């Protein structure tokens, strides 16, 4: 859990 690539908040594909 923390920063880098995976699932959660930030940039990429999903909702917003």
CB of 4 to Cl ion, least distance (A): 6
Question: Interface residues for a second copy in 1-16 (CB under 8 A)?
Answer: 1-16
* Two structure tokens written together for 2: 């923390």
How far does Cα 5 stand from its chain's mean position? 7
Instruction: Please state, as a whole number, how many other Cβ atoms lie within 10 Å of the Cβ of residue 11.
Output: 6
CB of 12 to a second copy, least distance (A): 2
Residues that bind Rb ion (CB under 5 A): 4, 6, 8, 10, 12, 14, 16
Residues that bind a second copy (CB under 8 A): 1-16
């Amino acid at each position: 859990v923390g920063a880098x690539a995976x699932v959660x908040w930030x940039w990429x594909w999903x909702w917003x």
